[PDB]
Ligand binder design. Sequence first.
Ligand SMILES: [Zn+2]
Length: 30
Amino acid sequence: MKPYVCIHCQRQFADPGALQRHVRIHTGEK
Ligand SMILES: [Zn+2]
């Protein structure tokens, strides 16, 4: 039902841990 969506690109993920992995992917450098 409820995903964890990327605030920056609006991609729906499962886990909040993946969002943190995801968001830092946008930074790239970190
Ligand atoms: Zn994203």
